[PDB]
Amino acid sequence: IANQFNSAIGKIQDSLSSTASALGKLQDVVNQNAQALNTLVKQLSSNF
Amino acid sequence: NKCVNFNFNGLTGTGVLTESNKKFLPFQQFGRDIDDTTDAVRDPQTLE
Amino acid sequence: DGYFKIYSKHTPINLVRDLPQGFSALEPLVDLPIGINITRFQTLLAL
Ligand SMILES: *[C@@H]1O[C@H](CO)[C@@H](O)[C@H](O)[C@H]1NC(C)=O
């Protein structure tokens, strides 16, 4: 049970080291807030 | 290095003026930020 | 709009018969206060 647990915590390092995509739901929140501020600043350049 | 009302050629606003590391080519007279706002200026009486 | 705009570039090559691969923008070289209508053009080569 300890070797299976130690091996599984092993794979958590391998997943969180290897891919970029595993943290997608946090990066999506950071991206949406950055995209809304990019929009808000771009509207200052609009003539109306 | 002091807050100033600047008026370059009628391009006008308030800011602190600081020496650029921006290499403006001989044709360039204003600089523009990602925000689409003026962020650097070539002085009209000395080419700095 | 009564201007004529010239952009240009100069580059070293080693090539026998084509327009070369790669990318490089043309800086503005001169602008002229021309005013004229244009509809065709010609080039001058040395004899
Ligand atoms: C502004 O005047 C000074 C003194 O005549 C001169 O050194 C300077 O080059 C002038 N600026 C330009 C753009 O020539």
Side-chain angles (χ1 to χ4, degrees):
Chain A
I1 289 162
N3 282 3
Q4 290 210 55
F5 176 75
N6 292 337
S7 179
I9 291 288
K11 299 196 304 176
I12 293 295
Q13 302 172 116
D14 297 346
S15 171
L16 296 176
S17 183
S18 303
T19 184
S21 61
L23 269 279
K25 290 206 302 284
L26 301 191
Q27 192 64 54
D28 197 10
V29 172
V30 170
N31 289 354
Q32 282 168 102
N33 285 277
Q35 188 290 314
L37 280 161
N38 175 42
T39 307
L40 177 66
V41 177
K42 285 287 298 296
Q43 291 298 88
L44 294 170
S45 72
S46 303
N47 290 56
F48 304 110
Chain B
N1 310 98
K2 295 173 186 175
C3 180
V4 78
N5 291 107
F6 61 80
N7 183 353
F8 288 91
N9 317 332
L11 176 133
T12 34
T14 322
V16 306
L17 298 176
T18 315
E19 290 89 341
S20 304
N21 299 110
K22 308 302 178 69
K23 293 93 189 171
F24 282 26
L25 282 296
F27 62 99
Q28 290 165 326
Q29 299 294 327
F30 300 101
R32 198 87 50 93
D33 194 78
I34 303 92
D35 297 345
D36 201 18
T37 57
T38 298
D39 76 331
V41 181
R42 180 172 275 167
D43 179 85
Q45 299 188 141
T46 191
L47 308 181
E48 272 88 338
Chain C
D1 64 61
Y3 282 16
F4 190 85
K5 314 291 293 193
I6 307 187
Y7 305 80
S8 187
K9 193 53 145 277
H10 184 189
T11 63
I13 61 157
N14 295 277
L15 205 147
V16 74
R17 70 199 175 166
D18 209 2
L19 180 156
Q21 301 301 345
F23 175 101
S24 178
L26 312 182
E27 297 78 13
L29 185 122
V30 292
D31 306 330
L32 286 305
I34 298 307
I36 85 190
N37 186 340
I38 298 173
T39 323
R40 67 185 179 272
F41 95 103
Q42 170 74 30
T43 185
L44 303 172
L45 265 69
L47 209 78

